[model samples]
Target: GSFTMPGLVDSNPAPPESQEKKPLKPCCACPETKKARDACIIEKGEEHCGHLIEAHKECMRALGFKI
Candidate 1:
């Protein structure tokens, strides 16, 4: 009779794959809003770009980032 290997006999199944995760990098996340926000800021300055700024912030927050 052959002897079984120590770890081979108790092989556990691999964990289930997770759902599609969002990107962690700020630059890589929310491209549409980022572009709009950047363009607005560059052309009108942050003082007058409040709308796009808040929009981008909301988008980022929705994507799970903390502003």
Candidate 2:
């Protein structure tokens, strides 16, 4: 005999806030905007966060990080 574990899942079947059925991305966020909603959608796109991380790394290099 065997038993399934509740630990099999860590995240909720759905997003906890905004009732979004999809995952939210960070980079798509306008960072600053007027409408407050369109900004949310884009910023929450997965590609946006990926681009932001890459950009930040480049910026750090230009600033002369020794690693």
- TM-scores for all predictions: 0.53, 0.24
Model 1, span 1-67: residue lDDT tens: 9977877567467545534777766556788888779778876788999888897899899878887
Give the number of the best model, judged by TM-score: 1
Query: What's the lDDT for all of these models?
Result: 0.78, 0.48
User: For residues 1-67, could you state the per-residue lDDT of candidate 2 as single tens digits?
Assistant: 7887777766656544564455665553333332233444455853555454454545545556542
Q: Which stretches of candidate 1 lie over 4 Å from their true place?
A: 1-28
TM-score of 1: 0.53
Q: What is the alpha-carbon lDDT of model 1 when measured against the actual structure?
A: 0.78
